[PDB]
Amino acid sequence: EFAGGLIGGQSAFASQEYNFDPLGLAEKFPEQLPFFREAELKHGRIAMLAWVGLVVPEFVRIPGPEKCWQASAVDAHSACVXXXXXXXXXXXXXXXXXXXXGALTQVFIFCGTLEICGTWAKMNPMGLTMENAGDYRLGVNFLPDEPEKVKEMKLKELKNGRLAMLAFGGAITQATLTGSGFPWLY
Amino acid sequence: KYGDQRKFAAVLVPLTTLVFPAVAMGMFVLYSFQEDAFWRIVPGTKRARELDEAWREHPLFANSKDPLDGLINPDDYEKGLEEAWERAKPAGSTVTVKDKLKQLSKQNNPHWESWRAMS
Amino acid sequence: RVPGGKRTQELGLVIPMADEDGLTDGQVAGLFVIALVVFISAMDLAKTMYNGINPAKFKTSKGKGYISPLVKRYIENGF
Amino acid sequence: XXXXXXXXXXXXXXXXXXXXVKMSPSVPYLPYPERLEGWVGGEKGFDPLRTSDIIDVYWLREAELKHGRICMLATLGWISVDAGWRFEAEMFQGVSVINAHNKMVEMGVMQQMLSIVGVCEIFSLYLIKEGLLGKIQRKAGDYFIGKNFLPKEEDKAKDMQLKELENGRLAMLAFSGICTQANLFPESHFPY
Amino acid sequence: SHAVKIYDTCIGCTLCVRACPTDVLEMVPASINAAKQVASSPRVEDCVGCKRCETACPTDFLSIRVYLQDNEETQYSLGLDLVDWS
Amino acid sequence: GRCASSRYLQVLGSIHDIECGFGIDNTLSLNLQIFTAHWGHLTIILIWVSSNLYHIASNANYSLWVKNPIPSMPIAHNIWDPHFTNSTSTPYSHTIITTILIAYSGIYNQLYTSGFNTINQIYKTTFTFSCLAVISILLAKIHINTHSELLHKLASHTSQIPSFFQLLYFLDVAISSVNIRFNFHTGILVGLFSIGYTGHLLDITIPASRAPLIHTSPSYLTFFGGLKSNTSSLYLTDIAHHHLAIGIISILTGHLYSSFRAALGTYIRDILYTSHLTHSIKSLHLALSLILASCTPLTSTTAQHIYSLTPYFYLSYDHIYSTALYVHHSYITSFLAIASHAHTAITLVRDWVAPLEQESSSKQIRIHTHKAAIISHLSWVSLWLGFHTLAVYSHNDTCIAFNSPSKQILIEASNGQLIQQASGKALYGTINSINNYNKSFDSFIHPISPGDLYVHHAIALGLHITVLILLKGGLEARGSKLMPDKMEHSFGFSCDGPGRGGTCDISAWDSFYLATFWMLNSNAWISFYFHYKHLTPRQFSESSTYLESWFRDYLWFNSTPLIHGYSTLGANDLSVQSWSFLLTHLAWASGFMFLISWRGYWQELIDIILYIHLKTPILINLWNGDIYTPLALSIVQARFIGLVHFSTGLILTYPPFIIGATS
Ligand code: CLA
Ligand code: CLA
Ligand code: CLA
Ligand code: CLA
Ligand SMILES: CC(=O)O[C@H]1CC(C)(C)C(=C=C/C(C)=C/C=C/C(C)=C/C=C/C=C(C)/C=C/C=C(C)/C=C/[C@@]23O[C@]2(C)C[C@@H](O)CC3(C)C)[C@](C)(O)C1
Ligand SMILES: CC1=C(C#C/C(C)=C/C=C/C(C)=C/C=C/C=C(C)/C=C/C=C(C)/C=C/[C@@]23O[C@]2(C)C[C@@H](O)CC3(C)C)C(C)(C)C[C@H](O)C1
Ligand code: SF4
Ligand code: SF4
């Protein structure tokens, strides 16, 4: 069985299986395949949200700390974190800014808390397997009750995630190279 | 003044280097005459017997002192040993495995841990 | 002070003494309270180490024992 | 399936059926922590980070109650002192709660209270140990106070003990917001 | 009390028995040597521990071995004269 | 029947030998007792730290020493002794003021470097460390209860199958687990402790050493070198960066073994099984031996590098601190070094299972197969070093007594000089490629002379002989040609009788007893070398190739201030030093009789004395001796007591000399 029987390896021309793995990592690391699918789904979801929030600020910009909330999508990370002391280390000597402190570290700490009580709580305490890889039981009531419908919905999630990962890479690289608007072209 | 801590010293130094040491020595010589004295290193104390029996009462440590503990199916081991000895028994030898093991387990050492008779 | 040793006399090394007290009596008493706490706890620990573990507690002591869920994992993870 | 699996040795283990696992109601993707079953709040079954997989729940419920109780008082203390309720005696004109701590420790009345809290907590430490050791008959966070207003319906007591926890948990998050908002905006009041 | 053990390498010298100052050892009949006799230690409670038996034993390594047990000493194993423990 | 007077010595000789306990029946009890003892010992250490901090806070002058550290002297604690003169003034007090003692530990520089400025901070630190002692004792109680609760949970434990008894071996998996312990030690306890100390330095130590600076920016991590000019110590920025680097490296290393999950990390057993090891890692004596052998290089390098590269403020400016610290840590590491071998011998006696006769698989097996070759070659190198060091020293002594300093044999220390030249070229290349050059390294490289070569050969001789005695004891602990049953007996036993040639000092413990004298002698040589080179580098460089120089220009000459301490002319502040000097001489000589005179004489003497007591009118009607019969000390007890006296005398005779010579 290819890659422990995970959704995502089936071709689209049907009657065929893309089972894309030129490096053969699925057979080299079968004990970390659930972690591989966890990472793939996490990257896909983060990249979907990242592409959406790479397009949107070109139109609307939340009015806030003017130090951030300004500039191109490229100059929006190092600007919305400011000259932190070393890296993601709050300046306790001068909280309330007045020189150097973060503006996203709140997003960072929220992501850390959610991740620890999310993936870490799923793996360390009293358990992830092949089937429950990306399944955090979030919005499963919306999932249809049919064996193939769930499988095709998961496949659509996976393929949208891969497309969003590649798309975000291309979009951010083009924006860095050129600037410009949504087309991200010279 | 730089002194005024000697008010603590004039009580503590005589106390902890005379009263406490003398009380400790008297208590130690009193403890030396208890039946429980040095029960962990001195053989034949009552508390040592009680502790050993308490360990033996635990279901895990019942057969813990037996050097042969571990044989999951001792009947299978004995049967296999008897079968292997039958094919190698020398000519008309009259020794069986069962009594051979029984007499190899029974040695004659009356003066071993005879100190388990006073406490 | 009457110094001894060649270097103290030939270099003028001196030992200053504070004219104040150092610690007030209240601070010394505050330290002695926690020292007494250490002392009581240490006497209790010495008693427990002297008597050692009591395996026969399961016949008389209440409750039913407990193995923490991580201790079970550490048991079955290996040795 | 309360058990983590069904087997005899953890090499040929047969894991429980995925749809048959108990599962936490708070975190739906996690199995239920069975160590919490029996305690008061053990119906939302919320323990991610697995801090009860390692530490006797008697300790955590002791710490949870102490935090909630101390926060319920601290939240009321901050609100009342901010709204303006200085004790009847003079020398209590600290003007602002944020500087009340440093003002009072200078005056000399905080050293008294720290002693009184200290002795009761040392008495608490003796209670917590012997309570855990199963020597005394004491539950978690049960200092034997009250116990006459405690409902005696074997279910109403469960609700009131739960009510104490819920109010304690709210106060923990309430006081943290109260204190943090006070420092950020020295405008100091229960409304802020 | 000490522990005096006799091993199979004994050749029935009787020298160990003769050297013992407290009559701990004795000769018993046996069939494992040309002398048809081996030593025995039926009264090691009287073994002071002088190890003269080990000095007298001529086998390659002593057929009689005395194991000292100092946390085991009795009045007989210490040779107490001024003091009685009974 | 009951016991004699030797019961006290017999009990106290194994008072902490938890393996020899009588109630102890399993590794669970042994491991839990050891864990609780560890907790109690940590409590003792914390209380000792709080003690020093308190006495510096209360009975001391830290607030004044911090202002003018170079010429000032710290105070250890007050003197309250009713035996002094109630009149006049002692030489340890400024007239009517209280009596004080000068601290020679070095805690003042430690606290000053760490960022302490006020007495109040030291008082709060004392309180916190007493709190930590409470916490440690409570953790001991907690773990005793948790293990007893597991034991009680065996009242609700059954596998429903005969394999349930397997749980016997996993009850102490909490203590006996190795992979988790290694992972968490090397990661947390080493790397993250270093990282936390880097944080401490960046937040306090560097801020409280210079003018106010930026918000602890990454410019606080420097790569200067050593010996900041003003304080004559390492740069605090360099120390913070060093701890940061060590912390990062050890944190990365700590993810090696399979600690918490079975899917990450390699097992230590599999690591050893595919190497030249695979030892019995379940032995507690083996682990103790190989970690004592780890604290030994650490403590020896601590002694070397506290002096060579002084890390504390104004530590090099104290002529007594620098010698006392070095000698103290050298003695500590010598004790740990001999401990490693002693517990290796105990491991071989008690906790080592060997194949039948020929299976050369275990490392100890392969060592034991050719142990005679090891011991013979160690004897050869020891003999060579002793012969050719003593003979050249004798040549120099004789030819310099005969008015011929130029007839000496002075081998120029060429190899050490080459190593020093290479290191100096590397350091100078480092310095020359700096825009902030002109740095100093203090005594990292020192002038090396023929005297240095001879003393190094003497030190190598001492180390070789100590290792020879210890290694022979370890290898023949399980049986030698003289006594081919030594593993049937205890680790320490009296002898094997006067027959078979005579067998005094035959046990492995007797090998340790013999080796402790050589450990003390080698340490004395090392300490004499360091102290002599410290007192006068020039005179050591020239006149130290003949032993008469060591006898005269160091011992006889430098003992002048100490003997003059108390005399019929007045007393100095060295009076305690001279009195302790004489007391330690008495202690050293008192242990000679426990070593030279042996038991039987004294047993007859005790029989005569007991005859007297049972013959004295009143005593006989109250005490017949049947209860706690007085007996002479047993042979092993006698050797140990003589060794203790000798060690105490030899060790404690030196600090008075150090203080008299340097201060
Ligand atoms: C400096 C080392 C030293 C010392 C102190 C002693 C001391 C002694 N030896 Mg000895 N001995 C030594 C080295 C030494 N030996 C050596 C190297 C050998 C070579 C083998 C021998 C061989 C030897 C033999 C063969 C004999 C002795 C005997 C004696 C005893 C007779 C002297 C006596 O009773 O005085 C009293 C002891 C003193 C140490 C005098 C000083 C006492 C102090 C200063 C006063 C009390 C202090 C005070 C109470 C403090 C309290 C303690 C504190 C904890 C509170 C005595 C215990 C003989 C014996 O026991 O016959 C009676 C005997 O037969 N010795
Ligand atoms: C990977 C996702 C991601 C990341 C890292 C960022 C990061 C950033 N965004 Mg952004 N954004 C995103 C997605 C993301 N965005 C999406 C999906 C939208 C569309 C609503 C926006 C719309 C948006 C605007 C309008 C602006 C930013 C801005 C910014 C910058 C300042 C931070 C801020 O306040 O954002 C604000 C972001 C939001 C309010 C949208 C949050 C939506 C999150 C991603 C969904 C929640 C995820 C959660 C963990 C899952 C549970 C909920 C789920 C059921 C949906 C920062 C670089 C500001 C800036 O300076 O731009 C240059 C700004 O003005 N973002
Ligand atoms: C110190 C506070 C404290 C303590 C000791 C406890 C203790 C407990 N809670 Mg509880 N709880 C608290 C606060 C606390 N609670 C608050 C404020 C809320 C409201 C959200 C809750 C809501 C809650 C629910 C809904 C449930 C519990 C349950 C439990 C029990 C099992 C959970 C466990 O093992 O965690 C004990 C250990 C800890 C709490 C330690 C956590 C410390 C971490 C490291 C701090 C992380 C938060 C940090 C401040 C945020 C970071 C800031 C920034 C980076 C974002 C245990 C008795 C469960 C129960 O009843 O079981 C019987 C249950 O179902 N709690
Ligand atoms: C035939 C004489 C002879 C020979 C060839 C050797 C050879 C050896 N001995 Mg040696 N040895 C000898 C006599 C001899 N020994 C004597 C008489 C003694 C008693 C003092 C020793 C004591 C001794 C010790 C203690 C050690 C050796 C060691 C060694 C080995 C290393 C070399 C060494 O250390 O030499 C140095 C030799 C000495 C220090 C001993 C003194 C040399 C004697 C005086 C020479 C006598 C020669 C003889 C008089 C010739 C007469 C010839 C005539 C009759 C025709 C080597 C195999 C060492 C070893 O095993 O390491 C591998 C070792 O540790 N030997
Ligand atoms: C209680 C509860 O809540 O339950 C929840 C459960 C759950 C599951 C969390 C939920 C959900 C689902 C969610 C939130 C789904 C969101 C999905 C998103 C945002 C997908 C974006 C994909 C973007 C792509 C593919 C971009 C593709 C972009 C491409 C290909 C770009 C292509 C470009 O060529 C173009 C077009 C321009 C060129 O210049 C270069 C580039 C950029 C490459 C619910 C509904 O909330 C309910
Ligand atoms: C830049 C910037 C920042 C940033 C950033 C970030 C997030 C940068 C991210 C970069 C990123 C995310 C780059 C992804 C690349 C993906 C690639 C190359 C995929 C190739 C995929 C290929 C070539 C696929 C080929 C195939 O399809 C082919 C042709 C046939 C198919 O049958 C099979 C396969 C699959 C084989 C900071 C640091 C945050 C702040 C700073 O201030 C500004
Ligand atoms: S001396 Fe030895 S060989 Fe001879 S009879 Fe006695 S035990 Fe046997
Ligand atoms: S040691 Fe002495 S008393 Fe004991 S059996 Fe041998 S000869 Fe007899």
mmCIF file of C-alpha atoms in Angstrom, chain F residues 103-261:
data_model
loop_
_atom_site.group_PDB
_atom_site.id
_atom_site.type_symbol
_atom_site.label_atom_id
_atom_site.label_comp_id
_atom_site.label_asym_id
_atom_site.label_seq_id
_atom_site.Cartn_x
_atom_site.Cartn_y
_atom_site.Cartn_z
ATOM 1 C CA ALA F 103 37.423 34.746 54.784
ATOM 2 C CA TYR F 104 39.709 32.712 52.514
ATOM 3 C CA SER F 105 36.938 30.944 50.571
ATOM 4 C CA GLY F 106 36.367 33.446 47.770
ATOM 5 C CA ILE F 107 32.636 34.029 48.095
ATOM 6 C CA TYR F 108 33.142 37.805 48.197
ATOM 7 C CA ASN F 109 34.532 37.869 44.658
ATOM 8 C CA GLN F 110 31.844 35.396 43.567
ATOM 9 C CA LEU F 111 29.019 37.614 44.833
ATOM 10 C CA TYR F 112 30.661 40.808 43.556
ATOM 11 C CA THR F 113 31.037 39.325 40.073
ATOM 12 C CA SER F 114 27.520 37.855 40.135
ATOM 13 C CA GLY F 115 26.103 41.354 40.677
ATOM 14 C CA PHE F 116 25.561 41.690 44.428
ATOM 15 C CA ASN F 117 25.828 45.274 45.678
ATOM 16 C CA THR F 118 23.913 45.416 48.970
ATOM 17 C CA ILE F 119 23.580 43.368 52.146
ATOM 18 C CA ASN F 120 19.803 43.257 51.593
ATOM 19 C CA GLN F 121 20.246 41.270 48.373
ATOM 20 C CA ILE F 122 22.415 38.750 50.231
ATOM 21 C CA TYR F 123 19.777 38.474 52.972
ATOM 22 C CA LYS F 124 17.032 37.829 50.414
ATOM 23 C CA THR F 125 19.300 35.258 48.746
ATOM 24 C CA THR F 126 19.805 33.496 52.089
ATOM 25 C CA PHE F 127 16.038 33.397 52.592
ATOM 26 C CA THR F 128 15.485 31.987 49.096
ATOM 27 C CA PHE F 129 18.071 29.242 49.574
ATOM 28 C CA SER F 130 16.520 28.237 52.905
ATOM 29 C CA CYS F 131 13.208 28.067 51.026
ATOM 30 C CA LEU F 132 14.893 25.820 48.457
ATOM 31 C CA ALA F 133 16.121 23.539 51.250
ATOM 32 C CA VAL F 134 12.522 23.238 52.466
ATOM 33 C CA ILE F 135 11.469 22.482 48.884
ATOM 34 C CA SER F 136 14.091 19.738 48.552
ATOM 35 C CA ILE F 137 13.016 18.004 51.770
ATOM 36 C CA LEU F 138 9.368 18.227 50.718
ATOM 37 C CA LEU F 139 10.288 16.711 47.341
ATOM 38 C CA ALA F 140 11.949 13.838 49.201
ATOM 39 C CA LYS F 141 8.729 13.260 51.142
ATOM 40 C CA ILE F 142 6.687 13.574 47.938
ATOM 41 C CA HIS F 143 8.709 10.922 46.122
ATOM 42 C CA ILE F 144 8.700 8.545 49.092
ATOM 43 C CA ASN F 145 4.910 8.839 49.119
ATOM 44 C CA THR F 146 4.562 8.414 45.344
ATOM 45 C CA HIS F 147 6.620 5.221 45.353
ATOM 46 C CA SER F 148 4.733 3.900 48.384
ATOM 47 C CA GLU F 149 1.529 4.739 46.495
ATOM 48 C CA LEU F 150 2.697 2.706 43.502
ATOM 49 C CA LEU F 151 3.443 -0.116 45.945
ATOM 50 C CA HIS F 152 -0.077 0.244 47.357
ATOM 51 C CA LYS F 153 -1.435 0.319 43.796
ATOM 52 C CA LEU F 154 -0.018 -3.176 43.563
ATOM 53 C CA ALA F 155 -3.002 -4.010 45.790
ATOM 54 C CA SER F 156 -5.158 -3.246 42.720
ATOM 55 C CA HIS F 157 -2.710 -4.695 40.189
ATOM 56 C CA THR F 158 -2.801 -7.996 38.311
ATOM 57 C CA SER F 159 -2.154 -8.874 34.681
ATOM 58 C CA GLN F 160 -4.700 -11.744 34.851
ATOM 59 C CA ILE F 161 -1.737 -13.789 33.577
ATOM 60 C CA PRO F 162 1.400 -15.282 35.145
ATOM 61 C CA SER F 163 3.434 -12.475 33.525
ATOM 62 C CA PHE F 164 2.167 -10.083 36.219
ATOM 63 C CA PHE F 165 5.360 -10.681 38.215
ATOM 64 C CA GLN F 166 7.284 -8.812 35.499
ATOM 65 C CA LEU F 167 6.090 -5.588 37.145
ATOM 66 C CA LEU F 168 8.619 -6.340 39.903
ATOM 67 C CA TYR F 169 11.423 -5.050 37.671
ATOM 68 C CA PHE F 170 9.674 -1.811 36.621
ATOM 69 C CA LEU F 171 8.661 -0.401 40.021
ATOM 70 C CA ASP F 172 11.812 1.757 40.190
ATOM 71 C CA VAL F 173 11.850 2.621 36.474
ATOM 72 C CA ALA F 174 11.517 6.209 37.701
ATOM 73 C CA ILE F 175 15.023 6.111 39.185
ATOM 74 C CA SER F 176 16.751 3.398 37.146
ATOM 75 C CA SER F 177 15.805 4.725 33.690
ATOM 76 C CA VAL F 178 18.921 5.915 31.872
ATOM 77 C CA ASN F 179 17.856 7.360 28.505
ATOM 78 C CA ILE F 180 15.408 9.854 30.024
ATOM 79 C CA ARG F 181 17.929 10.803 32.710
ATOM 80 C CA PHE F 182 20.723 11.370 30.187
ATOM 81 C CA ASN F 183 18.498 13.372 27.843
ATOM 82 C CA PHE F 184 17.106 15.639 30.543
ATOM 83 C CA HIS F 185 20.398 16.059 32.405
ATOM 84 C CA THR F 186 22.445 16.991 29.334
ATOM 85 C CA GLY F 187 19.688 19.179 27.935
ATOM 86 C CA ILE F 188 18.020 20.938 30.854
ATOM 87 C CA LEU F 189 20.449 20.654 33.756
ATOM 88 C CA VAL F 190 23.481 21.610 31.656
ATOM 89 C CA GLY F 191 22.451 23.539 28.556
ATOM 90 C CA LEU F 192 19.416 25.386 29.841
ATOM 91 C CA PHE F 193 21.093 26.084 33.175
ATOM 92 C CA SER F 194 23.932 27.673 31.192
ATOM 93 C CA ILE F 195 21.412 29.646 29.125
ATOM 94 C CA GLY F 196 19.614 30.815 32.264
ATOM 95 C CA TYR F 197 22.925 31.914 33.728
ATOM 96 C CA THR F 198 23.636 33.831 30.520
ATOM 97 C CA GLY F 199 20.297 35.538 31.074
ATOM 98 C CA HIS F 200 21.296 36.305 34.658
ATOM 99 C CA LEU F 201 24.572 37.833 33.503
ATOM 100 C CA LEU F 202 22.937 39.930 30.772
ATOM 101 C CA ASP F 203 20.206 41.156 33.133
ATOM 102 C CA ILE F 204 22.216 41.815 36.312
ATOM 103 C CA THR F 205 25.933 41.109 36.211
ATOM 104 C CA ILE F 206 26.856 43.189 33.156
ATOM 105 C CA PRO F 207 24.343 45.958 34.017
ATOM 106 C CA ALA F 208 25.741 46.113 37.567
ATOM 107 C CA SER F 209 29.377 46.409 36.494
ATOM 108 C CA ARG F 210 29.566 49.414 34.123
ATOM 109 C CA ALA F 211 27.750 52.616 33.235
ATOM 110 C CA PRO F 212 24.118 52.295 32.103
ATOM 111 C CA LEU F 213 23.843 50.855 28.607
ATOM 112 C CA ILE F 214 21.321 49.760 25.964
ATOM 113 C CA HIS F 215 18.504 47.364 26.831
ATOM 114 C CA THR F 216 20.836 44.353 27.165
ATOM 115 C CA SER F 217 21.438 44.351 23.402
ATOM 116 C CA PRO F 218 23.278 41.495 21.635
ATOM 117 C CA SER F 219 26.436 43.625 21.888
ATOM 118 C CA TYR F 220 26.686 42.094 25.390
ATOM 119 C CA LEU F 221 28.051 38.929 23.716
ATOM 120 C CA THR F 222 31.739 39.588 23.033
ATOM 121 C CA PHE F 223 34.744 37.523 21.957
ATOM 122 C CA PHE F 224 37.574 39.547 23.486
ATOM 123 C CA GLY F 225 39.780 37.058 25.304
ATOM 124 C CA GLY F 226 40.785 37.204 28.958
ATOM 125 C CA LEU F 227 41.790 39.442 31.845
ATOM 126 C CA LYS F 228 39.931 42.722 31.577
ATOM 127 C CA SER F 229 42.543 45.225 32.679
ATOM 128 C CA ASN F 230 40.763 47.114 35.463
ATOM 129 C CA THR F 231 39.316 44.187 37.437
ATOM 130 C CA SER F 232 42.023 41.688 36.352
ATOM 131 C CA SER F 233 39.375 39.121 35.432
ATOM 132 C CA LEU F 234 37.512 37.716 32.450
ATOM 133 C CA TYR F 235 35.058 39.962 30.645
ATOM 134 C CA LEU F 236 31.518 39.379 31.887
ATOM 135 C CA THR F 237 30.362 39.685 28.283
ATOM 136 C CA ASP F 238 32.799 36.897 27.387
ATOM 137 C CA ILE F 239 31.464 34.776 30.261
ATOM 138 C CA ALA F 240 27.858 35.321 29.162
ATOM 139 C CA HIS F 241 28.737 34.421 25.575
ATOM 140 C CA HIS F 242 30.620 31.319 26.742
ATOM 141 C CA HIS F 243 27.665 30.118 28.787
ATOM 142 C CA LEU F 244 25.351 30.839 25.853
ATOM 143 C CA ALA F 245 27.495 28.769 23.478
ATOM 144 C CA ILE F 246 27.799 25.880 25.938
ATOM 145 C CA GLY F 247 24.065 26.030 26.591
ATOM 146 C CA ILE F 248 23.160 25.895 22.907
ATOM 147 C CA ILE F 249 25.559 23.005 22.274
ATOM 148 C CA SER F 250 24.301 20.975 25.237
ATOM 149 C CA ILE F 251 20.641 21.711 24.452
ATOM 150 C CA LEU F 252 21.192 20.345 20.955
ATOM 151 C CA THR F 253 23.055 17.335 22.375
ATOM 152 C CA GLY F 254 20.283 16.634 24.897
ATOM 153 C CA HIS F 255 17.946 15.442 22.126
ATOM 154 C CA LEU F 256 20.033 12.296 21.561
ATOM 155 C CA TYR F 257 18.473 9.471 23.577
ATOM 156 C CA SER F 258 14.917 8.091 23.520
ATOM 157 C CA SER F 259 13.525 9.799 26.614
ATOM 158 C CA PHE F 260 9.759 10.361 26.481
ATOM 159 C CA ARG F 261 8.659 8.724 23.213
#
